[PDB]
Write an enzyme that holds these catalytic residues in place. Structure first.
Site, PDB file in Angstrom:
ATOM      1  N   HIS A  39       0.808  -1.215   0.000  1.00 26.39           N
ATOM      2  CA  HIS A  39       0.000   0.000   0.000  1.00 26.39           C
ATOM      3  C   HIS A  39       0.844   1.269   0.000  1.00 26.39           C
ATOM      4  O   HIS A  39       0.353   2.321  -0.424  1.00 26.39           O
ATOM      5  CB  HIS A  39      -0.944   0.004   1.203  1.00 26.39           C
ATOM      6  N   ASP A  61      -0.523  -7.799   1.129  1.00 26.32           N
ATOM      7  CA  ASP A  61      -0.108  -6.397   1.139  1.00 26.32           C
ATOM      8  C   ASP A  61       1.410  -6.299   1.316  1.00 26.32           C
ATOM      9  O   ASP A  61       1.920  -5.783   2.312  1.00 26.32           O
ATOM     10  CB  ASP A  61      -0.860  -5.617   2.226  1.00 26.32           C
ATOM     11  N   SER A 113       5.251   2.663   8.267  1.00 20.80           N
ATOM     12  CA  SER A 113       5.037   1.300   7.804  1.00 20.80           C
ATOM     13  C   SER A 113       6.320   0.730   7.213  1.00 20.80           C
ATOM     14  O   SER A 113       7.093   1.439   6.564  1.00 20.80           O
ATOM     15  CB  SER A 113       3.918   1.259   6.764  1.00 20.80           C
TER      16      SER A 113
END
EC number: 3.4.21.90
Lengths: 161, 52, 161
Positions: A39, A61, A113
């Site tokens: 993402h 992901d 992230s």
């Protein structure tokens, strides 16, 4: 001592991802594979890692690629054993209880992230994707390893950092 | 012309379904530093012939 | 201490091979079979071994023959166990990490092929074939022994010495 070696490994195994001149996520060198959450959008701040072909998978992901040969010695070491206890992380210490990665402080911020969760011996255990705000604790939406499988754990209410 | 067009569309759709099934069944093994399970390797041919 | 009998067994279990009068590799006596890797060309500097019939196998890049009876007492000892840790070598100590033999120095040079890799107790574990430049390190492409089978490990980018 543990913090110093963790930082030394992180400096040599973590690269920022730039999009429109701003940081969005981090790509880590684990084993023989470049890893980055799917993402997160942008380009890795490295000429060598830029032209690599990434195999994408939206179910987990995660985007992975095979590292170049000349960077194979600048990669961390992995593990698949996750016993109960405490583990290190760049923003403090993470608690693993009953299969959940929880952040006592709730210090997670969007753009963080892809930061690996480290083991006691400097090994990598999992890669963070997002956090779920449960009261004063932040449950981690994290991707981990089985013996040979990738498993994605997503607690309810988690949002992608 | 209609029959030939329909046959070509059907065969292309089936080939695409096979390719998608192979790629989706084989993708999780490229996200681990693990093995390829030669039993599945033989039935499901992959781009890495001998490496990893 | 360890280096002493290590090089002594090396003295007793290594013979040079010379082609056009210059050394090109080393052949070692392991168990009851003389081993010299197939890629190097030349003649063993010994009358007895140069007359033996060497079985060819390009898949494993190894040439083997059965040792004469009167050299049976000058042969090293073998094993099939590869625990994680450190092992000995003629040019220092080798590191075993995640199924890879790596040279800390990266000082391996052409002509060093065939030099055995020893255990702590003097047993032989593998035989050096070539190496791959992993930047500051070099991963060793070696041939080892399983319980009853010969297996070859070759990292990508390796070159034959």
């Amino acid at each position: 001592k543990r913090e110093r070696m963790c930082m030394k490994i992180e400096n040599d195994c973590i690269f920022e991802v730039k999009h429109e001149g701003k940081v969005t996520g981090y790509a880590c060198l684990v084993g023989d594979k470049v890893m980055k959450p799917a993402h997160v959008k942008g380009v890795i701040d490295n000429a060598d890692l830029a032209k690599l072909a990434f195999k994408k998978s939206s179910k987990y992901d995660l985007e992975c690629a095979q590292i170049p040969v000349h960077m194979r010695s600048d990669a961390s070491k992995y593990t698949h054993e996750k016993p109960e206890g405490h583990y290190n992380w760049h923003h403090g210490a993470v608690q693993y209880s009953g299969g959940r990665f929880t952040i006592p402080t709730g210090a997670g911020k969007p753009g963080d992230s892809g930061r690996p969760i480290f083991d006691n011996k400097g090994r990598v255990v999992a890669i963070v994707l997002g956090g779920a705000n449960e009261g004063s604790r932040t449950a981690l939406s994290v991707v981990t390893w089985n013996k040979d499988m990738v498993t994605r754990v997503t607690p309810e209410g988690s949002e992608e950092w | 012309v209609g029959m030939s067009l329909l046959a070509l569309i059907s065969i292309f759709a089936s080939c695409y379904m096979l390719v998608a099934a192979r790629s989706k069944c084989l993708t999780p093994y490229a996200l681990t530093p693990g093995a390829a399970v030669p039993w599945t390797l033989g039935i499901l041919c992959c781009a890495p012939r001998a490496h990893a």
